[PDB]
Design a protein around this ligand. Structure first.
Ligand SMILES: [Cl-]
Ligand SMILES: [Cl-]
Ligand code: NA
Ligand code: NA
Lengths: 395, 396, 395, 396
């Protein structure tokens, strides 16, 4: 209590508290400190089961408790992938009512029609520093030096990690006398944020020194020059991709569309065109889709992905096309940063959710990516199919 | 146990369980079922203190338990707003290490430099159906009729809601023979997703019948025509706004920048230009900022906003400018859908987090928006200031 | 010749030359001055017929001659518009081979199938200053003051012209403490650039003074704050429109598609979807079309529109849809700044081209807009139809 | 005269005339025809000095005469480039009054402050077909085969041209089962439109046949899949570049800014930020500049570039920054398709304008690009400086 009063008088700050007291009671002191300031008592945030010692060290600061997100599932979901095969029951954490049911309805239709074909198109994590040079003349020299000494930069970056591998520096953007080199890494099963920052920092320190020997002065202004692009919607991510780039598709027969979706293939194609394609074009949107962010969001929260990367997962294009025997229906997500180790996957509830998919640990990120894509297709098909019903009726 | 076997044999579906057995036990049964399919045991997801019966009816389906997100706070954060005044301790739920510490550092620097000036610029929620007409001739007629009969459409829309007010139908986009009317509503303290869908649907039925009397056949293809725009990044939202449009500002003197941020106003201006402005411009990004999505995400999860709306909050522009007396630093977030009742705010842990802000219930959505903007500035200032420190050092 | 030597020694500059000598010989002196510097003789740029006295005063500075652009035509083009009715032969000036022939082929198909239905959706010209305020608090006051005193601002702006009319100030954008008010004008038949700058300048001087009386200090940084948006591709123009917003459409029967286009309606829809819709989405394009800029460009050069406004005319969306009896095919151009008086319409060759359309002078801009839209449809249909042939064959 | 009547009766079409009569008289005949349909007489369009026979074969169809665009110049313009060195007088064809005067003012200010530093950053032309495959499985196979067999595709592509070199196929975009390979060519001094279409078509025929041997069926839907991107504004062009990518720079001392621009370096930086950067950001524009399209347009018309490529040249970013010794000012144009042979450069008046620059013919496209960038900077500097003058005055 004397500590609590020193917190109120601000002789001691909440951040330094963990060294004066145990970490378990550190959470209670912080929880009661902010309760007294706000004049409100809490019952729920203080009741959790995750490991507070490890959470403080890797996942959060100034911990006062935990929030609880309702967890449901959608399934069964038959997937025909390179890494995911069989039927999956997918966990989904959300506070939006009807979202899990919409995906679950999509999973059932897809599974009864043979499952989703899905493939990972690309797999990379990127970091794009901004480097200042004295003039455009140096910016050109800097760019051409990078491209011709890539193997040297690759050894320097890779000496910082047992798990990362630098595969490219492309594109290299120049605006005036500023250079934005997009370092491209393989990250194994980690999402790779921390690894690509450390590998790129050493790479940039090395470039700066090597160029200084050639009488060219540069310096990195910031390791993230907003050309990565990280946690913002960007054309560079839509085009070049980031994280996992995933495509999932199904072919449905006309009789399956009538039986399970209660509609027709031309209606589905019309809805997709008027809404997902034309509607996104005229409002200058980067999401030519209906529901990716919602499905990405629910699956990311359950499995401990970075919540801000829902921004990146909202990019993409749904294609629905009439075929002779029914529809072709596909989702394309060029920008899905996921991982099955590190980050939030270590928090206990999220670990269990990955275990229910068989996707926690090493050699599982590509499997998890394929599940992500199949789940998005299932849910995008459910939503687009339900809209085509109302479309048919009203017409 | 007999039922567990009937689930494995697929005699009964998981969705039908809540009525045969208690909803409390429905959750445990379908968790045993997912455990037996994946052949793995769980220990943590089964712990939940939240009310499962109402969560099943309003927030989730096929519930098996709960995910737990670590919850911290950042503060103190002094805010000079129209609705938020005083020092706030902002709760933040995240799994990303160091994020809360970065915002917590920003809150303290700003607080002892006088607090954050914040204003809500706009407050509205939108729904934009796709309407098919026979031809551009009818599409033009439709647009003009909407503009002419707006008051009547307004009364039909408002008859479905006690809090919703239809204030505009603008812009009204036409592509070929397709019409995308952007209905603009006031929603009170709700985020407004469900209110604007019910109000817009009856309005569209009324437009369709009134036009049929003039022998003009239209029909709504979908109540969401992707011109809203909802849960996607779009120029219409960046320009016209959606949800709350928030702006936060601070003026810092050169002596405060040196003492608290360990840098100068020139370096902060330089970082912001090269990274937030030029960097976003050349990569064709709509987020001319460093950290909005990260901060929005942590606050949205803690307070029960919709997770997919982090997409909308990642839009915006950070401005940092050298002034005679220091630096001017501001964030602009034109597209922040928040609510203090309904949706996920009902979930107990998230409700308590709104209570810690004094932002649960009616007449508090604008207070909450001002807190959101002040927190984003605090963290955006922390990050940019930390980058300008490295910037100066490497220059020397 | 003594003047020529003073030009070489730079005692006198080319700009001040018109007061020392006649304007006719001013052009010859400038032409020979730059010839001597470059050590090349010219024969063509010096042979023209346009009025040099008026061109110097309204269209060009430092004139040395004229460039000649080949002029052809496309037709007949039957148009079913509110202002354009009947068959038109459209002049087109270009240096690209096959462009006029592609449009001419489209005009013939369309005319044999009943002509193009076209309508002007909107008609406005805009100017968006950037105004600096001391703080966001003032920026809000500034915005709310503008909206509540619009009638006062409208009288002030309109006192500068007999032809402009201020119809709106919307949207009003605020970034931090900077305010971007989009002034919206009717301009009659002029494109309106010069009128909206003069009307807006007086409007801003008045706002600045009125706000100063209320103890709020603002000042306009620039009358064009890049939110207009003028001569750049922008979502605000795509969504809110600028200049003329035009939509043209045709319905074609299946037998007409086979007979005149040598293809089918599903092929046309497939080409449009894969190329104009999906291809533009994945490359993050604002032109969901094939050929607008080319057709806009050829028609603008012939009739004296501002060449940089081809940027704005490249925006838009082509929709091609299977119907029970054939196709629906439409073009949407939300951003087409044109005029039938002022600007370049006064240069003699361009005046004649507008006369061939019956579109020079007052009360003709909307007629000309409808012709622009019908011409773009004709050419977009020709190009998309020719691609669907190769598509059918290769499949 | 008898033929004139057969045109009015539609017995013969205008296109068939060039073979029955001389092409010189074909032009006069079909002008009489358009005159008689519109019931109006023309006097000016019938004057042309250009070679009509070759223009009819390479530049135009259904020719009736010529349009005349007023031609001026701006100079002197001192350029410090890799390929352009010395003082240039830049010809500019326009109907917009005051534009040439604005650039002419910029050229003189820069010239006596030391000239424009300019560099060509990149030089390539692109064509991106749409290829349909049966499924994403085959689309992945197709992408990997292209990457694996690039050298063979390169030899097939280069067999169609003496100047074209295929240097890359990147990026290779996949949407569903559709594949958009961006072929990247060197084109010498041509703009490359026609060369990259012929080379890419044979390359695609070769890919299609080689995949058929492995029992994988693909087919090119169109040689231009709108991912090129050609004559539209697109992020892929802003990011990866197309045509010439040009950057021009000047450093100006505070004393030169005061004396020649009548302003200060702070005001220039402020205008550029509020207008070119923030203004373009909030309106979702891809042109973070004031005047590129205007200057590009006048130069493109004078020198015979494609008018529709003004769309591509309007992209880019202007940077103005306070330096210890004055201001740094630069323009970046990542997407400028130019050529010095072929296309419209052949037209006589435009050829003479290239000659006035010493840029007609082979080994001069890079010189011409450097001149383009220096002219855009000169005019962009003139405009922004003129806006900063008004800025300072109204502030006082
Ligand atoms: Cl060099
Ligand atoms: Cl106030
Ligand atoms: Na409740
Ligand atoms: Na020739």
């Amino acid at each position: 209590n004397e500590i609590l009063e020193k917190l109120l008088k601000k002789e001691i700050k909440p951040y330094q508290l963990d060294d004066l007291v145990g970490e378990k009671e550190a959470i209670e002191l912080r929880r009661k400190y902010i309760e007294k300031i706000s004049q409100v008592e809490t019952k729920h945030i203080g009741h959790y089961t995750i490991d507070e010692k490890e959470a403080m060290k890797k996942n959060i600061e100034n911990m006062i408790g935990a929030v609880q997100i309702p967890l449901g599932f959608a399934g069964p979901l038959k997937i025909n992938g390179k890494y995911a095969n069989g039927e999956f029951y997918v966990p989904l954490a959300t506070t939006e009512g009807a979202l899990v049911a919409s995906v679950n309805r999509g999973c059932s239709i897809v599974t009864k029609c043979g499952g989703v074909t899905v493939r990972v198109i690309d797999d990379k994590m990127t970091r794009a520093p901004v480097i200042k040079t004295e003039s455009v003349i140096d910016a050109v020299k800097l760019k051409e030096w990078i491209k011709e000494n890539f193997q040297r930069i690759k050894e320097v970056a890779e000496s910082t990690t047992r798990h990362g591998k630098l595969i490219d520096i492309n594109p290299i953007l120049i605006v005036g006398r500023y250079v934005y080199p997009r370092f491209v890494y393989k990250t194994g099963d980690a999402m790779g944020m921390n690894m690509v920052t450390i590998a790129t920092e050493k790479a940039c320190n090395f470039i700066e020194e090597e160029l200084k020997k050639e009488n060219i002065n540069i310096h990195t202004v910031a390791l993230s020059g907003n050309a990565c692009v990280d946690k913002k919607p960007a054309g560079i991510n839509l085009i070049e991709g980031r994280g996992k780039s995933i495509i999932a598709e199904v072919f449905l027969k006309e009789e399956e569309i009538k039986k399970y979706l209660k509609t027709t293939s031309k209606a589905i194609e019309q809805v997709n065109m008027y809404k997902n394609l034309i509607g996104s074009a005229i409002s200058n949107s980067m999401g030519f889709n209906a529901h990716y962010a919602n499905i990405i969001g629910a699956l990311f929260l359950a499995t401990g992905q970075d919540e801000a990367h829902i921004v990146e997962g909202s990019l993409g294009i749904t294609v629905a096309e009439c075929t002779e025997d029914g529809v072709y229906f596909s989702v394309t997500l060029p920008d899905v940063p996921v991982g099955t180790v590190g980050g939030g996957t270590r928090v206990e509830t999220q670990k269990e959710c990955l275990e229910l998919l068989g996707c926690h640990g090493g050699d599982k990120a590509l499997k998890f990516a394929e599940i992500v894509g199949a789940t998005v297709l299932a849910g995008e098909l459910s939503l687009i199919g339900a809209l085509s019903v109302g479309h048919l009726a009203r017409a």
